[PDB]
Amino acid sequence: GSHMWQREEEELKQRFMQRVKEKEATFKEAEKELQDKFEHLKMIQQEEIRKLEEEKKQLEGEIIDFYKMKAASE
């Protein structure tokens, strides 16, 4: 009857609600995996930046020693 027919509507509306919810949980996880993969690659490059800065600073110190020696030599 009328209540069973209304319940049938609600069961279908609840079905789609849950279906969209499970689909959303898969997309959220795929985005999570995606963010972790690129966060990993970003950390590596941020360590490369600091090593490069440290190398630049070391070369600058060698150039100071060399120029000071040239001035003090003759």
DSSP code per residue over 24-36: HHHHHHHHHHHHH
CB atoms within 10 A of CB 31: 10
- Shortest Cβ distance from residue 23 to another protein (Å)? 6
| CA–CA dist 26, 24 (Å, integer) | 5
Q: Binding to another protein by residue 14, rule CB under 8 A?
A: no
| Residue 48, binding choice from Na ion, another protein, none, Cβ under 5 to 8 Å by partner class | another protein
Nearest residue to Na ion on Cβ basis: 49
List of residues contacting Na ion (CB under 5 A): 15, 46, 49-50
